[PDB]
Ligand binder design. Structure first.
Ligand SMILES: *CC(=O)N(c1ccccc1)[C@H]1C=CS(=O)(=O)C1
Ligand SMILES: *CC(=O)N(c1ccccc1)[C@H]1C=CS(=O)(=O)C1
Lengths: 304, 304
């Protein structure tokens, strides 16, 4: 019993974290097979970052300008290419610690673990979601760029995020591992505001299901609702609209707890309209939206 | 910027997690050098757990009754001893992945990362504190025992906790790695209630310092207080009394933010007496007490 905000073990990803230096700039890189992936702004000064032309800046760079250090041993760079907003550095040695891995572009609402790294040395690990405004609420200082987001399916590391920007509001933007940014963000120090940070309605329902299971049941009510009725309340409270797809995904938890998805929606509705009244659900004073249905099932069944 | 509940990388500890089977019982073990550490209740059925005499139960066991599996390779057991509430299984092979390590008995209020394991396979990792009632608020199912708590100082893993019991209230009890339980708990399925779960006042102040730094400042006030005055409020609200030692420890954060420890105490006092008024500090609707002063400094300076 007990429900915690829980990250995948980072061991498999600690073994891929290297230091990438280009001139004065030193951020983190991901060494998989004979390729090291890092943010392309490694080639930039903080002065370049106001309006960089990466194609032009890159012409001036050579294989030998990119210094890749894995622990206290340097890797020889035998090729470099720009894909979108990441560089791919081909090294002469394949990473002996390369796990099974895929690159996956995640959807908003999806969760992943982040290994925070400075100088290719991991500092800590926490769990995150891709917000519906394509930001993430991270913890990232200077030198934390090229830190990666991942999920783990038994032995296979699916990489979903590489860290790039901190918006003036202190929320975080970044790319998949094909270097395509999540949302309309660009590796440029410009006016970049995030849209409405809406609550991930399905994840809140999952997390309510997790509470019931883990003993916290005060918030169960006699009422039910419809999708259309519940959504009018969701809209008002800047909650993501709930679809039949979201309901289907909550079926397992529905079945396990024998509480209908729409009964639990009616529970949430009342929590939105009436608040918590100074009470707590799973040691939290607000409605947590960074646990997927899949995250609850996993933690409540104990998958390794 | 941004402040997250952050665990140490678990890589160094993933490499010490093995499966320990004795008869039908299979929990997790910690393989360091040529010794595998596990909870002594591995020798028990769930029927033994009502009133076990471990000395007597252990006489019936031999080196060959203890089956230790590291991945898909079995380790040969050449000796076994009981220390307090843990078994130490001497194996013929030393763990090639043994990091630098110490065993440390932590104090209440101190934080540590937990790698949750089932069948010696890590499932996830989260950050915890030793509560002032010598419980921890974990996430642990059946087979999660012998999961370990640790801190990491650069390369040295200090192990502070091995998981043993879930109290009828769904909070968790366990030992240091010398097998001595935190608090008055015993590896016996008996009436065991936790005492008053008080709030770790120093950690709340640290976490308030973390907020100020990270942009959240609404809760700063014009008022200051004394230690004796603040403590009368702490007592009322079941908060741990603040000492000159706690103040001294908050000096670095005091100095960095140029907010006096007693000014910040006056800030907290008002939050206790007036609540948050539907507002949030670092994305949390209540006062978080599972970040040490040291945890804030580390995350706000980016130690690896
Ligand atoms: C993204 C990041 O953390 N860094 C950065 C800053 C400007 C341009 C590229 C990368 C830091 C990486 C190391 S640093 O101290 O040079 C700045
Ligand atoms: C502590 C724990 O998780 N387990 C346990 C239960 C009873 C006695 C000793 C250990 C589980 C370990 C594997 S299990 O399924 O046999 C029970």
């Amino acid at each position: 019993s007990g429900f915690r905000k829980m990250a995948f073990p980072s061991g498999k990803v600690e073994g891929c974290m290297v230091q990438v230096t280009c001139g004065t700039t030193t951020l983190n890189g991901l060494w998989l097979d004979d390729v090291v992936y890092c943010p392309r702004h490694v080639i930039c000064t903080s002065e370049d970052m106001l309006n960089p032309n990466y194609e032009d800046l890159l012409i001036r760079k050579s294989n030998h300008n990119f210094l890749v250090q894995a622990g206290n041993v340097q890797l020889r760079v035998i090729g470099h290419s720009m894909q979108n907003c990441v560089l791919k550095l081909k090294v002469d040695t394949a990473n002996p610690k390369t796990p099974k891995y895929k690159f996956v572009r995640i959807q908003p609402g999806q969760t992943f673990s982040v290994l925070a790294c400075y100088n290719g040395s991991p500092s800590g690990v926490y769990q995150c979601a891709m917000r519906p405004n394509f930001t993430i609420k991270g913890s990232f200082l200077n030198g934390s760029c090229g830190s990666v987001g991942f999920n783990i399916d038994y032995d296979c590391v699916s990489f979903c995020y590489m860290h790039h920007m901190e918006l003036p509001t202190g929320v975080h933007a970044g790319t998949d591992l094909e270097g395509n940014f999540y949302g309309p963000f660009v590796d440029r120090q410009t006016a970049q505001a995030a849209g409405t940070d809406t609550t991930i309605t399905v994840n809140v329902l999952a997390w309510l299901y997790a509470a019931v299971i883990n003993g916290d049941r005060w918030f169960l009510n006699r009422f039910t609702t419809t999708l259309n009725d519940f959504n009018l309340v969701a809209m008002k409270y800047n909650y993501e609209p709930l679809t039949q797809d979201h309901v289907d995904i909550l079926g397992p938890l529905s079945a396990q707890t024998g509480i209908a998805v729409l009964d639990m929606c009616a529970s949430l509705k009342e929590l939105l309209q009436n608040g918590m009244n100074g009470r707590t659900i799973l040691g939290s004073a607000l409605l947590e939206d960074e646990f997927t249905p899949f995250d609850v099932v996993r933690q409540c069944s104990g998958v390794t």
